[PDB]
């Protein structure tokens, strides 16, 4: 998406927190002055964090960003950005944003995303399968309260996973099975009780860990398999006397 | 072993700049009340929020002079 002619910077951008960054990213004067096509092909990465940005709208046009990073109360249309292919790098923090629906579909370049609490306070289908490329995923803190299976089955080349600071209380099985390259991964500050028998059992190129601070189930019958984990590797960042049962501490011999 | 120093290295454990400007925030000191409370008058995202927090609080313990280990 493009420009004919000049153009007032506010005429793309409503959102007028958004206006105020991208006039600072091109060394603008004011808010007022009309901007040219290549002007916003000049930008390739935009940095912001006020509390007063709602839209992205008019993010579309310059197509050279390669990197976005913007944290504010509350975003809502980050449709804008649907249409990127050019950004590598995607950083959202804000109390709510909304997940249109496919998203991310075109933005296949990009190898690193952090996202936000949703709406929905859950991941919708097939969220990210279309991102091949990315290495990169943070889930901290994104208040996400359950898994939804093969969510994370076409992130091949993904590096790690943070999973820390949501409220899952279970994992899908096999989860976790379609990472050769995974090496570390975060499950600390959820609410998860147990794990699904085999969850870890692929995860070859994994090097830490978090397990803490979630309520784990600690009957004789069922975390066997979990306890036999912890005891038979040494990614546990922390270490495993960090995880611990309801009433007792470590986990433990049984 | 200057708290700035200290707080540098605190920071510096997070990665995102945006994060990173939140922790420093935090730890710039509030007299009038705490580290909670000047949390609600802030408006932006989860990762901010929780690095300033955790800036403020460990700073404030800093100056207690609690040692690393009895620090929370």
Redesign the interface.
């Given at each position: 998406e493009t420009i004919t002619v000049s153009t007032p910077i506010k005429q793309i951008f409503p959102d007028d927190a958004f206006a105020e960054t991208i006039k600072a990213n091109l060394k603008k004067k004011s808010v007022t002055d009309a901007v040219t096509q290549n002007e916003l092909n000049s930008i390739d990465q935009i940095?912001?964090?006020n509390?007063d940005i709602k839209s992205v709208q008019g993010i579309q046009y310059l197509p050279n960003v390669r990197y976005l990073?913007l944290?504010?109360?509350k975003l809502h249309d980050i449709s804008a950005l649907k249409e990127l292919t050019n950004l590598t790098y995607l950083?959202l923090?804000?109390?709510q944003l909304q997940l249109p629906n496919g998203v991310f579909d075109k933005l296949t370049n990009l190898k690193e995303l952090?996202l936000?609490?949703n709406q929905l306070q859950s991941l919708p289908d097939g969220v990210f399968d279309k991102l091949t490329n990315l290495t990169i995923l943070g889930l901290?803190?994104?208040?996400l309260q359950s898994l939804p299976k093969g969510v994370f089955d076409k992130l091949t080349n993904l590096t790690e996973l943070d999973l820390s600071?949501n409220q899952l209380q279970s994992l899908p099985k096999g989860v976790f099975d379609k990472l050769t390259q995974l090496k570390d991964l975060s499950l600390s500050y959820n609410q998860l009780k147990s794990v699904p028998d085999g969850v870890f059992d692929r995860l070859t190129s994994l090097q830490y860990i978090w397990l803490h601070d979630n309520p784990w189930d600690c009957t004789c019958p069922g975390i066997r398999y979990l306890s036999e984990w912890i005891n038979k590797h040494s990614g546990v960042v922390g270490g495993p006397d960090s995880a611990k049962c309801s009433g007792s501490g470590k986990p433990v011999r049984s | 072993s200057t708290l700035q120093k200290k707080i540098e290295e605190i920071a510096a454990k997070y990665k995102?700049?945006?994060?990173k400007?939140?922790c420093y925030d935090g730890a710039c000191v509030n007299n009038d009340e705490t580290c909670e409370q000047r949390a609600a008058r802030?408006?932006?995202?989860?990762?901010?929020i929780?690095a300033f927090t955790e800036c403020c609080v460990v700073a404030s313990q800093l100056r207690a002079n609690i040692s690393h280990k009895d620090m929370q």
């Open positions: 940095i912001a964090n509390s990073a944290g504010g109360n950083f923090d804000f109390n952090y936000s609490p901290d803190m994104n208040q600071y | 995102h700049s945006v994060v400007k939140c802030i408006s932006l995202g989860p990762r901010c929780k």
